[PDB]
Amino acid sequence: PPNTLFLRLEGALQSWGSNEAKFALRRTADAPTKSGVLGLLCAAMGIGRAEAADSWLPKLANLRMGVRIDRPGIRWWDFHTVGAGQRMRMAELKAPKKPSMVGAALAETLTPSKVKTRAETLLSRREYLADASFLVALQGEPELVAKLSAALAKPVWAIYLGRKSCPPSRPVCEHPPGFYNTLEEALSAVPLQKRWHNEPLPQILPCVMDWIPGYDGEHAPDDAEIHYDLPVSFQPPRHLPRFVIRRELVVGEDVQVSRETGTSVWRPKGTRADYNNSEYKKVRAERL
Amino acid sequence: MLIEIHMIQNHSPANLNRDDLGAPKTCYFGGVLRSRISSQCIKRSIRTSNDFKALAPDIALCGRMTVEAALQVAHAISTHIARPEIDYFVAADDVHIGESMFASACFYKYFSIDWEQLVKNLKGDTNLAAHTVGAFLLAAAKTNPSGKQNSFAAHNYPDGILVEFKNSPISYANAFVRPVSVVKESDLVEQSIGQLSNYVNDIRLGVIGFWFSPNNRYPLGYKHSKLASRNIGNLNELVGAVLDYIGGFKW
Amino acid sequence: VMYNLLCDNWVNVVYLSGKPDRISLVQTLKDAHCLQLAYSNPMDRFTVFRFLLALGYWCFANTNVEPEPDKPLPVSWIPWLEENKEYFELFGDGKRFFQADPSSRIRAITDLIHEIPTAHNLCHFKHVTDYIDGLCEACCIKGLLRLPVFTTVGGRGIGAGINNTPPFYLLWHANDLAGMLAQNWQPWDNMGIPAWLGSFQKESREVGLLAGMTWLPRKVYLHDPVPGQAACCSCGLPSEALVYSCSIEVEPVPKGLEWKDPHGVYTDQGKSLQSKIKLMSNDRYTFADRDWYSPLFSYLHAEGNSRQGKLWLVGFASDKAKSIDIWDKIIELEGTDTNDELLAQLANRATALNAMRKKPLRGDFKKSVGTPQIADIIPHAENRIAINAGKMTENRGYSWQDADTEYGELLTKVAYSLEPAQTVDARLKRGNFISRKPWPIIP
Numbered sequence: 001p002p003n004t005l006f007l008r009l010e011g012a013l014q015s016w017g018s019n020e021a022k023f024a025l026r027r028t029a030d031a032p033t034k035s036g037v038l039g040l041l042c043a044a045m046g047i048g049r050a051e052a053a054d055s056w057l058p059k060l061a062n063l064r065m066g067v068r069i070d071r072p073g074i075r076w077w078d079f080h081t082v083g084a085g086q087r088m089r090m091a092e093l094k095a096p097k098k099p100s101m102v103g104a105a106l107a108e109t110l111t112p113s114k115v116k117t118r119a120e121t122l123l124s125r126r127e128y129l130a131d132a133s134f135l136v137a138l139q140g141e142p143e144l145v146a147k148l149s150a151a152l153a154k155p156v157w158a159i160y161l162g163r164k165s166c167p168p169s170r171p172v173c174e175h176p177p178g179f180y181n182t183l184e185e186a187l188s189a190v191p192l193q194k195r196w197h198n199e200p201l202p203q204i205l206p207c208v209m210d211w212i213p214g215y216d217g218e219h220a221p222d223d224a225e226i227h228y229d230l231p232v233s234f235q236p237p238r239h240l241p242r243f244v245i246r247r248e249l250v251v252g253e254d255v256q257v258s259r260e261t262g263t264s265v266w267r268p269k270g271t272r273a274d275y276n277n278s279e280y281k282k283v284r285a286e287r288l
Numbered sequence: 289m290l291i292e293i294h295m296i297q298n299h300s301p302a303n304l305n306r307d308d309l310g311a312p313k314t315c316y317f318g319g320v321l322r323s324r325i326s327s328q329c330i331k332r333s334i335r336t337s338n339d340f341k342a343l344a345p346d347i348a349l350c351g352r353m354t355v356e357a358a359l360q361v362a363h364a365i366s367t368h369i370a371r372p373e374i375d376y377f378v379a380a381d382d383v384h385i386g387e388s389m390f391a392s393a394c395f396y397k398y399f400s401i402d403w404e405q406l407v408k409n410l411k412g413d414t415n416l417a418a419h420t421v422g423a424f425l426l427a428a429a430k431t432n433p434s435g436k437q438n439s440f441a442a443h444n445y446p447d448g449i450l451v452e453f454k455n456s457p458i459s460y461a462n463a464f465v466r467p468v469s470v471v472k473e474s475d476l477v478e479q480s481i482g483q484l485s486n487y488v489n490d491i492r493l494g495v496i497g498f499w500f501s502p503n504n505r506y507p508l509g510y511k512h513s514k515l516a517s518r519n520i521g522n523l524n525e526l527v528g529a530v531l532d533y534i535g536g537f538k539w
Numbered sequence: 540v541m542y543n544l545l546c547d548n549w550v551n552v553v554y555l556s557g558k559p560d561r562i563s564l565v566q567t568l569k570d571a572h573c574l575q576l577a578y579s580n581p582m583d584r585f586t587v588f589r590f591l592l593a594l595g596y597w598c599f600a601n602t603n604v605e606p607e608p609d610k611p612l613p614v615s616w617i618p619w620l621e622e623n624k625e626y627f628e629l630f631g632d633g634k635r636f637f638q639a640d641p642s643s644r645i646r647a648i649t650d651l652i653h654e655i656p657t658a659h660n661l662c663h664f665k666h667v668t669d670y671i672d673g674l675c676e677a678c679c680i681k682g683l684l685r686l687p688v689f690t691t692v693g694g695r696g697i698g699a700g701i702n703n704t705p706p707f708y709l710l711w712h713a714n715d716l717a718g719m720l721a722q723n724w725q726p727w728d729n730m731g732i733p734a735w736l737g738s739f740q741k742e743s744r745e746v747g748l749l750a751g752m753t754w755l756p757r758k759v760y761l762h763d764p765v766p767g768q769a770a771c772c773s774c775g776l777p778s779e780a781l782v783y784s785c786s787i788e789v790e791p792v793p794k795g796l797e798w799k800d801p802h803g804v805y806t807d808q809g810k811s812l813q814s815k816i817k818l819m820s821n822d823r824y825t826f827a828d829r830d831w832y833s834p835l836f837s838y839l840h841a842e843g844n845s846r847q848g849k850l851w852l853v854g855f856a857s858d859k860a861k862s863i864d865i866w867d868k869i870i871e872l873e874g875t876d877t878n879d880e881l882l883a884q885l886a887n888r889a890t891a892l893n894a895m896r897k898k899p900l901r902g903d904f905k906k907s908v909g910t911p912q913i914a915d916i917i918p919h920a921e922n923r924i925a926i927n928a929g930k931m932t933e934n935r936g937y938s939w940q941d942a943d944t945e946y947g948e949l950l951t952k953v954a955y956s957l958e959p960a961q962t963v964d965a966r967l968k969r970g971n972f973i974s975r976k977p978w979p980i981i982p
């Protein structure tokens with residue numbers, strides 16, 4: 001039975017936010033995050049934000065994760081404005097007479113007229129990756145893999161690429177599950193697809209993997225980094241650190257290249273019939 | 289189920305969305321630069337419009353402050369290479385040369401609607417959801433962003449719409465990896481529609497859909513192919529067909 | 540009711556085996572070499588390390604044992620902190636940690652945290668409401684540690700902290716807590732009295748290290764926690780009774796007060812050197828990326844000099860009482876000399892990028908924004924260039940001309956959009972356009 005499942009993340013625009021976004025400047029990571037993938041799987045299966053934290057996120061946390069960067073996108077920035085021609089909500093509230101009551105007790109007395117608004121325009125800048133493709137392999141129990149593949153075949157809710165304005169360009173369940181021993185073999189099994197006949201093709205594909213602890217102990221190596229993308233909750237968000245390593249695969253020996261398998265340019269139809277074709281002479285004789 | 293809407297629309301020289309420096313918004317695709325119209329402009333262009341004002345609706349479709357909106361709008365992208373242009377202007381006195389930016393492009397737009405979410409947000413009502421879907425289709429067909437419209441009266445209408453009922457969400461941006469090059473025996477919109485046709489001619493070889501063009505001006509498929517289940521020349525008839533397929537409601 | 544920083548768990552760490560945990564100060568000093576400090580926000584990762592460094596300085600001053608490299612922390616440090624258990628308390632009627640006497644200026648506990656909106660701030664990216672959601676004890680401790688380093692002006696009648704505008708913060712990085720403590724150990728002859736000790740006094744001129752590192756520009760009380768079953772709005776941990784309100788008063792900084800921060804970066808005139816990031820591109824600014832090249836000429840010539848290691852940079856942009864952004868970076872430095880002119884040119888690159896952007900496509904016009912398409916491609920080129928930051932700083936194999944190559948492909952792509960013609964004039968114009976690059980300007 002298969003033990004790993006594959007996901008393809010491709011689109012015109014996508015974003016995977018990083019921990020360095022606490023203000024109106026929202027940046028993105030170079031590779032898809034574990035939290036984003038787990039949230040996509042939860043949305044596909046149909047678990048809400050308050051239910052995922054109960055015995056659905058711990059189960060998916062045990063899965064091993066690895067991403068292969070087929071083609072990387074270009075970092076692009078978008079200027080975003082909020083609330084022009086309207087009023088924005090403020091967080092200011094009247095101080096209580098005594099500190100005895102706060103929170104739920106004071107929330108029951110909240111009224112629509114108690115809130116305060118101000119006429120302003122919020123400014124922000126947001127980062128996206130343009131023309132990027134990623135392959136994610138998740139390894140673990142076979143029953144969970146089968147359930148995830150079945151859910152991904154028909155999603156309960158709409159699935160996007162980190163932000164709701166980023167719909168996929170290719171099906172997420174393009175590659176069927178298989179059986180492999182290590183993440184490297186699973187990532188090398190799926191081939192690499194071209195889009196048209198003559199285009200630049202990367203000679204070396206980077207890959208970002210989780211770091212297996214190996215035997216008991218085995219302190220992390222000196223090239224291991226800390227990523228704060230282990231999901232614990234979604235409302236309110238809560239993330240934990242994890243160790244991540246980077247490797248590479250050189251195409252032509254471990255990753256193959258697929259053909260075009262299609263037509264790009266449309267072009268009009270065919271005029272200019274032939275006066276030497278036998279069919280033309282036959283139909284001309286018949287018409288005569 | 290999910291209802292997906294694909295639109296192809298050509299716009300006259302205008303500036304419908306610009307950045308802090310006053311230039312039209314852009315993006316990178318297919319190894320080239322393309323024009324872009326932001327998603328939060330098309331939204332708030334379809335929304336807050338007088339035409340769209342036709343269990344509180346307009347919140348189930350687009351939420352506000354765990355409403356879980358059922359409408360998804362993507363970023364409008366161009367089918368060719370971006371061609372920004374600069375206009376030089378001066379101001380008279382009737383008693384200093386400035387420059388402005390403008391561009392013209394053909395855009396592909398993608399919308400998605402989740403029927404089950406719309407029904408659940410309406411507390412079981414099913415006729416109201418169908419009415420909302422029809423109203424949204426009519427509003428999206430006949431609305432444009434209110435940018436520099438007083439100086440660029442760009443009020444063009446879409447030249448082609450496709451409605452699909454696929455099992456999984458997917459966009460056809462990959463049909464425009466190669467930018468469209470205009471030839472003498474065709475035009476830009478026709479070539480874009482042909483490129484779209486040669487992306488559903490495939491896929492199926494290696495669901496149903498409704499195609500709409502004004503008075504059958506541009507037919508999907510440059511042949512007698514059955515790539516479209518029905519071809520309709522009227523917007524109201526397209527709305528009626530979609531309404532029927534949703535489960536048999538009358539517009 | 541009762542909470543002690545030596546017993547209760549408030550320090551978030553990750554063990555080198557790969558297990559996240561929340562431990563106490565005593566256990567943090569016990570292990571100190573099998574774990575790293577784990578914090579999403581660089582601010583906390585900096586203030587917790589500063590607090591640990593101050594505690595180590597105090598323990599060394601009162602014990603006279605230094606931390607040996609590649610070894611556990613000194614044992615005798617632990618009993619001393621056990622003796623002074625009365626000075627580390629968060630509540631109760633008596634001595635309070637980093638707090639003062641109660642007042643009547645009641646404020647919800649959200650101004651201690653910059654990223655969570657409060658008062659007049661707009662609650663769009665973080666849905667919060669005052670006196671409705673609060674913080675846990677660990678977040679209160681983490682927000683009390685931000686006062687000496689990250690306090691800005693309050694508008695009218697309220698001043699900044701000891702360092703005025705919060706400047707860049709540059710230090711050294713290691714893969715374990717003991718290593719980080721051992722690479723920034725430099726003590727002084729005069730230490731002073733720390734704030735967590737008895738009532739701090741401004742007294743006379745001169746400051747020292749312990750007093751300066753723990754300067755408190757505000758008085759806070761931290762009234763009490765109120766029972767409930769809510770969740771913290773900072774970490775998201777599902778917890779029990781939180782605090783909601785406190786009292787804050789302003790302490791002015793007396794004139795004079797000769798102080799030089801061990802980690803801060805200063806300008807030629809003695810003013811603080813701060814990050815220059817903004818959300819918009821005005822006439823005198825072009826948004827590219829993190830400005831990692833700004834606190835380099837000052838650091839590598841005044842304090843820190845050339846030294847093999849990992850330089851950790853923390854930058855926090857601000858404008859009056861408004862927060863903008865925070866970022867961090869790590870640069871691998873070998874410590875191979877320095878060139879004054881090249882380092883000065885590197886320290887002034889935002890002006891070069893602005894000059895490159897402002898050049899119009901043709902002609903010369905007053906008040907012209909200039910080629911906005913270049914600003915769309917500048918951030919990607921800056922991000923690509925920033926990878927070889929260590930080699931660019933020391934000019935080992937990377938140079939300004941080497942980094943100038945990254946713009947070629949993007950400018951070639953832009954030229955097709957700018958000149959979409961199949962004529963000779965368009966091709967010549969594209970050839971002229973391709974050869975644009977920033978020019979180094981030293982003053």
Ligand SMILES: [Mg+2]
Nearest residue numbers: 675678771774
């Ligand atoms: Mg907390």
